[PDB]
Amino acid sequence: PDRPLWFPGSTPPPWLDGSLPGDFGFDPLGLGSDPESLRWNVQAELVHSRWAMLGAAGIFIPEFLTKLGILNTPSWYTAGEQEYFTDTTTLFIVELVFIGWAEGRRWADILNPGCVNTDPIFPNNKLTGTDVGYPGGLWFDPLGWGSASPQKLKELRTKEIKNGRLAMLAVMGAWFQHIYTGTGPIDNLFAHLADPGHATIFAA
Amino acid sequence: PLWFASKQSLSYLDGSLPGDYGFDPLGLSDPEGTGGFIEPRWLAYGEVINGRFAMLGAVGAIAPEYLGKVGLIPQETALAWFQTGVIPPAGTYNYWADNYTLFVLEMALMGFAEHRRFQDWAKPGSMGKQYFLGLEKGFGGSGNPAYPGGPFFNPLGFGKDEKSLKELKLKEVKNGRLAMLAILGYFIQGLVTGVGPYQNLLDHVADPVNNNVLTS
Amino acid sequence: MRDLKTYLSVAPVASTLWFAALAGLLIEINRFFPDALTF
Amino acid sequence: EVKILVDRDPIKTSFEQWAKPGHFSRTIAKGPDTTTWIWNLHADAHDFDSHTSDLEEISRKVFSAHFGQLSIIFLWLSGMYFHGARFSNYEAWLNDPTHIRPSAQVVWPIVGQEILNGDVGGGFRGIQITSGFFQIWRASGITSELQLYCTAIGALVFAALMLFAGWFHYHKAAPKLVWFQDVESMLNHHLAGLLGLGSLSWAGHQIHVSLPINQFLNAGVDPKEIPLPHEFILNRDLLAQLYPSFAEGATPFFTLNWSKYADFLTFRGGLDPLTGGLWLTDIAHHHLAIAILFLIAGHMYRTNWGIGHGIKDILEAHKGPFTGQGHKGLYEILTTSWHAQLSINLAMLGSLTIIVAHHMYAMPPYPYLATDYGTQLSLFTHHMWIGGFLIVGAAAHAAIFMVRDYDPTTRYNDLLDRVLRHRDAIISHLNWVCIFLGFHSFGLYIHNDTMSALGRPQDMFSDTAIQLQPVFAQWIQNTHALAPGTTAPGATTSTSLTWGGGDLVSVGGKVALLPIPLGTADFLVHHIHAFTIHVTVLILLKGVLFARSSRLIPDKANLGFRFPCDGPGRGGTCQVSAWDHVFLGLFWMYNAISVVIFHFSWKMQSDVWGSINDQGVVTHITGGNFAQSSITINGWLRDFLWAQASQVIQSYGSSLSAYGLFFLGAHFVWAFSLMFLFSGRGYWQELIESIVWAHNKLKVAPATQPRALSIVQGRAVGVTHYLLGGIATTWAFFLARIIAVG
């Protein structure tokens, strides 16, 4: 409510208090001005953050070890085009039925916040989350680190969304660098570390 | 004193303006029907800001040319203004970075400073408010956007009282005006002579009759 | 934003978006299954 | 005290009014009761008068709307340069302009439409363009797709800048009324500023980029090996080797030894014989002199100092015994009525475009333009239509001025009043001269057709019978041909190879220009032009002179500018409004321009265009058939329309087939227009009643009650489809023919 803003001296939009984690008053196009949309965009930002972080660590760490020798994992940009134990199109069907189910229940939870906290096969199992986007329970917060004081939950979720935002620019950078340069990300960083003033986005 | 003033320019230029010579043959700072960037408060700021950069430029665009001809900086770093990489077809030089990579660092650093500076013109009380490495203690301005002062911009305490500040503002203004004409001088002398400004100053002493604006 | 969403719903705007989507669909059916005279 | 006067934040920027259709109008804003609402919303969108009566607030709307138009043009030019850069054979065309067909559009492969990608040369497949952009870019010294890419980005930037300015000068800093009325400052800034600094700065490009690069192209060196344009600025010796005047630099300019520049500033005339276009050294010298004239002309009117006139003084000082007070009061009219300004500007801009049509064909200003018969037939026709439309627009806003802005009590003018006091003498005289013209032009054709049908070709108006030689035009032709040695000593050759005399210029075995002969047939078709133009002025001028009143309708001005009629009484008063005169004048403008462009197409194919032999035996496209064929209507039916329509009706199955489809499509739209022009909304409203009943029977009637188009809309819809179908038919007929045989 008196927090640092993405634009010091500017005035934050009325729909952004500071009660949301990662609230820095940035929405110059009013994409979240309607409260119904702002709640949907929070959930969309949360899942974009969590997929980007898994994706970032899934392309930066494995490529970081193959550039050496600890791993031999192929280029992240081409790992999809190679063949596996079954064909790629069977893996995609198994992915949809498995991810669609998990996505379906998350969807139901967004539109009806308490309806899917109970295990449909063994109704003894239950999730523990109170807020949409933080399902809790044993399967997603087995340590109990998700249930804390609202002061710590504000920071912990701000750490969550900040790491997810950075990961989003990073993953999108890894996709763009691989097309403008011609190698992997670990190569780009060393090249820029070999000569910082010249080995950049300029080649001409 | 009035430099080609008129009895309509005197109606709004009340002398309460550092450098108020009454000069306005086109009625630009007329407070009747202002808007956009044609505005009295803003034009004074633009006169000052352009004046300050020209003072850095008029000296810097001739400092390596002067220091080099004497032999004070290496002859491989002493250059004329239009041959340092600013205009690649006229001259380049291998700095520690590419000529375009340097501009990104420039606009990145010049961005932060010029962006924060604009907020003291818009919201005067700002910049000192939002955290900034504790440096925000000397970013609160002064109620004057063009003369913020403080520990960062007036660290020595000049303009101590009334009669000193207005005498300082008046000299600060007239210098930028001549430096701006100097910046204007370096530009046309470059395109018409093809040589540096300090050399143009030289050949007008070695032969004033045959080295002139009329010979080119 | 709600004013913008109202404008985006006005007859001409909703028509181009609807017919654009339609044209794209029919074009791609014709790129995938061209020259269909029967059925 | 001419100064910048602006108001701060007049109109708040908000999407609130985007959500409210018809907000600008108090009637329309309440929402639709009927479908008629939908149409009035659009008919009234730009009628800024009906939105607000405040002249200041009207001017602000037209100012930002102008920025809107400029934004659209820059975006249009961005795409033209972008397609030249990305989807063209311009780079290949530079190596072989006599053979490779300009192409800058490529169709995606879908539903069989690839056939429109034609074998145009240069290893390219695309649609042959006739806008002429390739001849422009070459004359500008553009040598690569990279240069077009950068011009397209700059055009895109200017499009954004112009759009920003429109929003800026309406919502942020909107000029006050008196700022717009400072017509002295505007004229000075447009003469000296726009026209002057535009022609001067463009002359600089011609000197430092266009002249040198075209010298390498014409010498034969490959464009990839021609020095980049900035090398002629960085290194003067490159220039000096082509034109040794640059060796002395800007010194001969200030020492009045201008004759030293006679190698890149010339007065040769004629056409560069190895390129077919005007001499680029004559053109550069043209823009130079033209730029001087405008820079000084922009100093004529008085502003913030003493020198110069007040435009009111010049007007108030011209008046004669036959006119009385003369031009007094015109300065108040032309500083308070936007329609009076728009009427004059449309009149002149339209007239000027028709001149551009003539001058650009007889003095081809671009290299390898004259031999691209398809581009040149397109350019002349395109600018005729644009010119004729703008002219008819002048009559509308002249008519709109008389209904809405004319006020003899506040802004009197004795010149305007004197014409109103004898409008019956003007219109009756124009009526008679039209009847004379029609009989003594078209009637001669009917004489010829009847004589030729009866087996009596000796009694025709023909070059081989009763001859009607255009002595005066023939005389002017023979005069200009003798000007370079006599009345224009500095001129080497005539200003145009059309000037009856000289010789011939060919490019790649194709004739560019020769002397154009003017005989009996040229006499007839010229008196058709005078006839058709006279009737167009008769209808339009009558519409403005009786816009306020007539013996039939004494209070017509109270019925507005645009109204269907005043009912069946007085024997019937349909189409008394000035708007209806503009409706009728469009059909006649269409008529007049159609035979003008037909006159152009047949003459060029018959007596000018064609292929030259090894020894000089010219074979024209239609072999001189214009003289004996174009003097009967049957000759135009048979030897022009029936014969030249061959290409378009056999274009199916080839890359020209899209003209085949457009030929038939435009016939359709033209015939479709007749439904509107021949019927009346009463029939249609009753029909709709039976249809509405059927919808009610199934509970599907709309709350927006369906109405027939208004009487005026019916007419507007009619003339719009009539002109679109009519003109598009000739478009598809011209392009198919000229691309197949040119």
Ligand code: CLA
């Ligand atoms: C014909 C078009 C047109 C006209 C008549 C005006 C008229 C006006 N504008 Mg405006 N404007 C235009 C286009 C136009 N503008 C465009 C395209 C933009 C977008 C960039 C703007 C952006 C703009 C702003 C932001 C402001 C105005 C302002 C003004 C007012 C004072 C201008 C003045 O003399 O300030 C003095 C002019 C200058 C100090 C500029 C001098 C140097 C610039 C760069 C001019 C160079 C242009 C030149 C022809 C280009 C040559 C390029 C070539 C060498 C390659 C006046 C009513 C001002 C206002 O509101 O006044 C009340 C104001 O604040 N305009």
Ligand code: CLA
């Ligand atoms: C007068 C301007 C003009 C015109 C008539 C064309 C025409 C054409 N261009 Mg071209 N182009 C232009 C300017 C223009 N261009 C400019 C300025 C650029 C540079 C940015 C390009 C860059 C360009 C490329 C890169 C390509 C074309 C292509 C094409 C062809 C197919 C385009 C197509 O089907 O799009 C597809 C249709 C759509 C995208 C329309 C979507 C419908 C939506 C719903 C309408 C939205 C309406 C909305 C309310 C208003 C939005 C406004 C918004 C912009 C602010 C077509 C002949 C293509 C081509 O030639 O392929 C061989 C091609 O690949 N053009």
Ligand code: CLA
């Ligand atoms: C610079 C040129 C110019 C300008 C600024 C104006 C401006 C104006 N004219 Mg004017 N006019 C012009 C040229 C111009 N005209 C010309 C050249 C003609 C001769 C044709 C006319 C004939 C004319 C008449 C007869 C009338 C006006 C009217 C008006 C006013 C209202 C316009 C409006 O709201 O229309 C809104 C615009 C439309 C509804 C567009 C309709 C669509 C057009 C007709 C079809 C275009 C077809 C297109 C080229 C081909 C694409 C086909 C494709 C879609 C399949 C406005 C002041 C009206 C008035 O009452 O003034 C007060 C009026 O009745 N004008």
Ligand code: CLA
């Ligand atoms: C081909 C069809 C056609 C013809 C012949 C005419 C003819 C005429 N129109 Mg017209 N018009 C037409 C279509 C046509 N229109 C259409 C489609 C429209 C709708 C847009 C209009 C709208 C229109 C308007 C709005 C105006 C005209 C005007 C005119 C007259 C022009 C003056 C003139 O040349 O008189 C001379 C007549 C002719 C050249 C016709 C041919 C005469 C023949 C060749 C001579 C016959 C000799 C002798 C009588 C033999 C017969 C003997 C017999 C009795 C036994 C003229 C009577 C204008 C007018 O009245 O100005 C005076 C006028 O203002 N028309």
Ligand SMILES: CC(/C=C/C=C(C)/C=C/[C@@]12O[C@]1(C)C[C@@H](O)CC2(C)C)=C\C=C\C=C(C)\C=C\C=C(C)\C=C\[C@@]12O[C@]1(C)C[C@@H](O)CC2(C)C
């Ligand atoms: C960054 C992007 C979102 C950026 C959107 C931001 C900027 C929008 C900003 C604004 O809207 C605001 C906020 C407010 C408005 O007023 C203004 C604008 C400016 C409009 C999301 C990317 C989201 C990117 C995420 C979702 C991608 C996750 C990808 C994972 C699955 C990849 C897995 C793999 O990479 C591995 C691990 C190994 C490989 O070998 C194989 C594969 C499969 C490739």
Ligand SMILES: CC1=C(/C=C/C(C)=C/C=C/C(C)=C/C=C/C=C(C)/C=C/C=C(C)/C=C/C2=C(C)CCCC2(C)C)C(C)(C)CCC1
């Ligand atoms: C094509 C195109 C484009 C481009 C354009 C351009 C490129 C332009 C340029 C332009 C230019 C670049 C211009 C320039 C100008 C200049 C000028 C105009 C100058 C003037 C001068 C003067 C006036 C002078 C004066 C003087 C005198 C008189 C004497 C002595 C002294 C002096 C010299 C000072 C665009 C993108 C837009 C768009 C699209 C198309």
Ligand SMILES: CC1=C(C/C=C(\C)CCC[C@H](C)CCC[C@H](C)CCCC(C)C)C(=O)c2ccccc2C1=O
């Ligand atoms: C044929 C015509 C009729 C009827 C034609 C009118 C009613 C035009 C109908 C225009 C459209 C087609 C009406 C429907 C418009 C809706 C936007 C359609 C929505 C459906 C979607 C496909 C967009 C009259 O109005 C009449 C007017 C006076 C002189 C003669 C004419 C004329 O001859």
Ligand code: SF4
């Ligand atoms: S027919 Fe139509 S236009 Fe002619 S009078 Fe009757 S209503 Fe008015």
